[PDB]
């Protein structure tokens, strides 16, 4: 008896076919396009959407005016349109099944800070975030998988202590300055 939880959960699922060339080239196409580290991050986003589609599958089988479908359906739609994956014009459970992996990969932090012009490349973005430069509405976010929602997208900027922002230059600039 201890004051602990032991409540964990795996955030990915390994595919059944380990060496299928159709999937190996598809996943690698998403890694280079969005600057990912390995295949686990692809299977992670694939596992999140696979759970969202399963939630929509359980609701679409219910009656149209079922109280559980109306409540949990709107809650599922609100969280999808909040993070920018789903559009406000499509507020029906039928359009959830039309989502793809790239819809969630475009909402990751390193993708946003690359589309916002803060980074010169998608790989420059991840290193830019991991080095404590990108902040979200006065909060230094260090995680590239930070799924940016709509109300937090207009507040992505450099940190107030970054050499790129309004801060003291790094140790390389300060050491190369005291030399000459």
């Amino acid at each position: 008896p201890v004051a602990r939880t032991w409540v964990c959960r795996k955030t990915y699922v390994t595919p059944r076919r380990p060496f299928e060339k159709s999937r190996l080239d598809q996943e690698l196409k998403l890694i280079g396009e969005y600057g990912l580290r390995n295949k686990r991050e692809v299977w992670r986003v694939k596992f999140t959407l696979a759970k969202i589609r399963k939630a929509a599958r359980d609701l679409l089988t219910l009656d149209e005016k079922d109280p559980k479908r109306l409540f949990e359906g709107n809650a599922l739609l609100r969280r999808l349109v909040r993070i920018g994956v789903l559009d406000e014009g499509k507020m029906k459970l039928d359009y959830i099944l039309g989502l793809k992996i790239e819809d969630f990969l475009e909402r990751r932090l390193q993708t946003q800070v690359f589309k916002l012009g803060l980074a010169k490349s998608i790989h420059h973005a991840r290193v830019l975030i991991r080095q404590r430069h990108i902040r979200v509405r006065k909060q230094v976010v260090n995680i590239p998988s930070f799924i940016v929602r709509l109300d937090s997208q207009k507040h992505i900027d450099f940190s107030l202590r970054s050499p790129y922002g309004g801060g003291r230059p790094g140790r390389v600039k300060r050491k190369n300055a005291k030399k000459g």
């Binding site: 008896p1 004051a3 109306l70 409540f71 709107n74």
Partner: protein, 258 residues
Amino acid sequence: ARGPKKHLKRVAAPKHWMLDKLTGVFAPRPSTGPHKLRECLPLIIFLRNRLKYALTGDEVKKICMQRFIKIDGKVRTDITYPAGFMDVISIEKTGEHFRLVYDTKGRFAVHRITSEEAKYKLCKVRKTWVGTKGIPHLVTHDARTIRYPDPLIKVNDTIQIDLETGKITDFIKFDTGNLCMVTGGANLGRIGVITNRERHPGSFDVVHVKDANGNNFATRLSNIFVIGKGNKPWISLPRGKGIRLTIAEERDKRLAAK
């Protein structure tokens, strides 16, 4: 297993206490008293978890030992006192008076009352017997034995006592048309007007209650606590008296208040 248990795990604690996990292994086991273990709110949880007057169990004891807290008028120094339903928690130091009454979620909410109130409390009769020398007695829902009650008071009516003298001031008979607050799970905290009582001999009598908005729901006779005569409650009701808004209506009221 050899005798009475004196501990209580947080995972086994009553859910309406709203205790977290990572604070400790044990939950405050309420001492023996007027109310049952599963149907009470110990004084340590009400002062610390609800009112935030204390941060630790030791700070709770520093308050109770100064004789500042009075449950039903009498000072209680035990931090694990049951202090269940309808009990009045008067704090003269801060001039605050509370009365434990369930909300629509089935939990003891912080219900502040006035100084004109906190002098009486409603009690449900549970047993009527005739003592020695032909003296009728009474058993309320909080272990208060009352001698010489009104002969019209029966085994299910609700009496009104005075916290200063403990004598019955008034009583509400149990019949179709009176208010009641269900206290038996899945309807705990709902207030409505009694509309029908199904009598099952040798079993539990099921009553049917109707809210003010027209919502009908059934429960057991042992869960009914008559609140007022007709539809006027003799006590102060918290916000959201007994309507129990659905999950769809609670979401609308949540985002509309933004």
